[PDB]
Amino acid sequence: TFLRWAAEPEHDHRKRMGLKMLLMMGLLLPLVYAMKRHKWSVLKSRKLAYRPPK
Amino acid sequence: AVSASSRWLEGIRKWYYNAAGFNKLGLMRDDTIHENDDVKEAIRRLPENLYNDRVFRIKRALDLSMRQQILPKEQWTKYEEDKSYLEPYLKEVIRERKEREEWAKK
Amino acid sequence: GRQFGHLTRVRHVITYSLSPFEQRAFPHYFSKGIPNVLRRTRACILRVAPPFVAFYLVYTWGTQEFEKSKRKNPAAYENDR
Amino acid sequence: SHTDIKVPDFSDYRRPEVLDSTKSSKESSEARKGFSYLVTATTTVGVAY
Amino acid sequence: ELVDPLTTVREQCEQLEKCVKARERLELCDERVSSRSQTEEDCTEELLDFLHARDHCVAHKLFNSLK
Amino acid sequence: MTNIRKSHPLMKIVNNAFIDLPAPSNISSWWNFGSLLGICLILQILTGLFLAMHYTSDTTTAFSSVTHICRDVNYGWIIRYMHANGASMFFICLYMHVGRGLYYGSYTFLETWNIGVILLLTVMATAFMGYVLPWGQMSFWGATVITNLLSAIPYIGTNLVEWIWGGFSVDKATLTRFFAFHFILPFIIMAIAMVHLLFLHETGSNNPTGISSDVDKIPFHPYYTIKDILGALLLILALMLLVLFAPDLLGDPDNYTPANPLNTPPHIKPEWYFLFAYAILRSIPNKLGGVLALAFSILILALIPLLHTSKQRSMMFRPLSQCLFWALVADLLTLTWIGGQPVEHPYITIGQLASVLYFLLILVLMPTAGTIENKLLKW
Amino acid sequence: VAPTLTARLYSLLFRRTSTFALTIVVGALFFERAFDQGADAIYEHINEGKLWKHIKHKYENK
Ligand code: HEM
Ligand code: HEM
Ligand code: FES
């Protein structure tokens, strides 16, 4: 362990945000994906009507 | 020298024709074509009756692809019916330039 | 040229849509969507996998072929002579 | 002729609040929209952090 | 003294079959070598084979056995 | 145009190369890369800068400095990896942007394509030097041969190598030069990008169906911006996860030892994408003829648009082309792993096996495909 | 009948975009002060006695 830590003094800390980011992380993704869909909603809701008087 | 195999040719044709999704999107063969110069002026010479109808199906087509839905199979295009309407116009533009192309050689 | 104005010429098409508020972000996204996932996945998997097989085969094929070829010096020539 | 046109139903993608044909849509409209925005704003707090 | 957990955990896995199984091969090598060792033969190649899976067993056990 | 605030500086009217630039309706997340590519790069510049801020290029200094970086420098550990690992991500971002082009035949646009061609060639050497900068054991030896490689020129190479060296060996000035090169070089690319883009505004993007999209367009801002934003956000974790929890995964180079010209590594490999070329490099026993291939390897991309064989651009409707298309995909990835192998006899054969296949896939098969299929539909 | 907080909220805050913007910073502030404070416990809950925070008490100021 001693050497293993020596080459990586940052290590036991570097997981803090590693943890910290993941908690944060799941929040945003759907929100966008929703808003994404929310905007796109009007797009995929289109309806065509081809009524040439023709 | 092919007679029965000629009959045997059409299956894979019909098969291969059925192996490309645009049959299942309600397209035809002609509207599939990649553009070209002959393609261009060919468009000019079309009557609207086709032309407009050419338009809508395309416009119809694209929308579906947006939503990842394939046309209900009942309504898929049929290997029995393919409209060649493009080409009888196409051969004109091909032909004429070949002259100019050649007649300007010498 | 001017991007939205002059592109094509189109007549007698009609279009209908709603405020995005008027509707839902997931109209049966789970239930109704899952089949659509499935149906089209096969159209590809027909034409997708077959090579991936080949490598992994050859991958291990050569791997083994590599191993014994190397691994064992007294394999064919054993250490009597 | 032209008037032969009609509106097909979008009730599907909708949510039930204004889904009724006889209701003032304004009743939820206040609460209706705020859901859409409450998402939008909360999205931002994270981005800011 | 303390005898270590190791030597103990050494024995528990070498107890396993493929261990002694190939350990024979070592002797299958070794004994044949003992007469024929003039020729290039050495059992090292097999020793590693012997030791490989040997400690693959020894892997999980003693790290718990240690402090 | 009355009181439009986008006129007043005309610069804002150049801005409408975006916000009203129309786009077809159906666009796959396949298309999100062009965005990402530029974004992957922006980050590069910055991080690749702050490095220099504490970095010194010197034969004695550089390593110990870089040692010192993750040691005493605030967050010297996040940053270095942000630079290196972030480099890797730029690749796979990039190739897809290629892959899209082929699989729909977007290459049909000739010049825009070509710009991409050059644009590609540029990027590699950047990383190459960027990889030498560490001055690690491999970086020394890796470039040592790859540079020595070019000596195979029959005549002018002899001087020319030592020239780019500036010496009989890899010694100091040969380092320092690269630093400048590796330093300036991205700015050049960024300029070129604005060219590559430019033509695209002329003819607009293409659509997956390989069909004229004229009839249906979209105002760019309300939508594709968003899918990009998410698309951008996709990238985050992709680096974040790797860069943070498990650094050394694609940090495959193991050499933190000082570069030793006396010592030679028992195994010699560049990093991954550098290998697949170097794999082909291993193949041919002929020194010169081999290099010739390696050159010819990529450039045929520009040739490909001469190979439009059919009356339909995209491959989504051609199974066989698609069959072919995916076939080639593996042939590369094999070589990757192959170049990831020592040169024992199956591999020896294997590369020889897989090598000629590669071009053969391109150079023979693919053109004939539509030819049949053109004839098949009776086109 | 009372409005669900949603109907209150827009009328109260989200209507004027400034306010709509204003609140954003506000909670974001209180957010982080609480947020990070939680994860570390969870973090250090996970790692017990592996850290001086736990360990160093053995020898800290003798
Ligand atoms: C396309 C963008 C870039 C590429 C392909 C690139 C290439 C590389 C690569 C592959 C490394 C090795 C990373 C490592 O060893 O950890 C590196 C390191 C470095 N790069 Fe870049 N880099 C880019 C951006 C930049 C920029 C813009 C600069 C200058 C402002 C820069 C300066 C450096 C420096 C100082 C290092 C030292 C760290 C090291 O070499 O390990 N890089 N570069
Ligand atoms: C750093 C490298 C590159 C960057 C930053 C880059 C950036 C972009 C961007 C932002 C677009 C617009 C998005 C799009 O049209 O889908 C684009 C389009 C394109 N790029 Fe590049 N690209 C790069 C490399 C390449 C290469 C190597 C090629 C080809 C050899 C290439 C060929 C194209 C093509 C054909 C398009 C248009 C595709 C279409 O509209 O269907 N790009 N590129
Ligand atoms: S020349 Fe040194 S290995 Fe080929």
Coordinates of C-alpha atoms in Angstrom, one line a residue, chain D residues 1-48:
Chain D
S1 CA -64.0 22.2 -50.9
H2 CA -61.5 24.0 -48.7
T3 CA -63.9 23.8 -45.7
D4 CA -63.9 20.0 -46.0
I5 CA -60.8 20.0 -43.8
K6 CA -61.0 19.0 -40.1
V7 CA -58.8 18.6 -37.1
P8 CA -57.9 15.0 -36.1
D9 CA -57.2 14.3 -32.4
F10 CA -54.1 15.0 -30.5
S11 CA -55.6 14.1 -27.1
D12 CA -53.1 11.3 -26.9
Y13 CA -49.9 13.2 -26.3
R14 CA -51.8 15.6 -24.0
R15 CA -52.1 15.3 -20.3
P16 CA -55.5 15.2 -18.7
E17 CA -55.8 18.6 -17.1
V18 CA -57.3 20.5 -20.1
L19 CA -58.2 17.3 -21.9
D20 CA -61.9 18.1 -21.4
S21 CA -63.7 19.8 -24.2
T22 CA -66.0 21.9 -22.0
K23 CA -63.5 23.3 -19.6
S24 CA -61.8 26.7 -19.3
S25 CA -58.2 25.8 -20.1
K26 CA -57.1 28.7 -17.9
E27 CA -57.9 26.8 -14.7
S28 CA -54.8 24.7 -14.8
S29 CA -53.0 27.0 -17.3
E30 CA -51.3 28.8 -14.4
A31 CA -50.4 25.5 -12.7
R32 CA -50.1 23.9 -16.1
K33 CA -47.3 25.9 -17.4
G34 CA -45.3 26.3 -14.2
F35 CA -44.5 22.6 -14.3
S36 CA -42.7 23.1 -17.6
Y37 CA -40.7 26.0 -16.2
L38 CA -40.0 24.6 -12.8
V39 CA -38.0 21.9 -14.7
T40 CA -36.3 24.5 -16.8
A41 CA -35.1 26.6 -13.9
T42 CA -34.0 23.7 -11.7
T43 CA -31.9 22.4 -14.7
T44 CA -30.0 25.6 -14.4
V45 CA -29.0 25.5 -10.7
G46 CA -26.9 22.5 -11.4
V47 CA -25.2 24.0 -14.4
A48 CA -24.3 26.9 -12.3

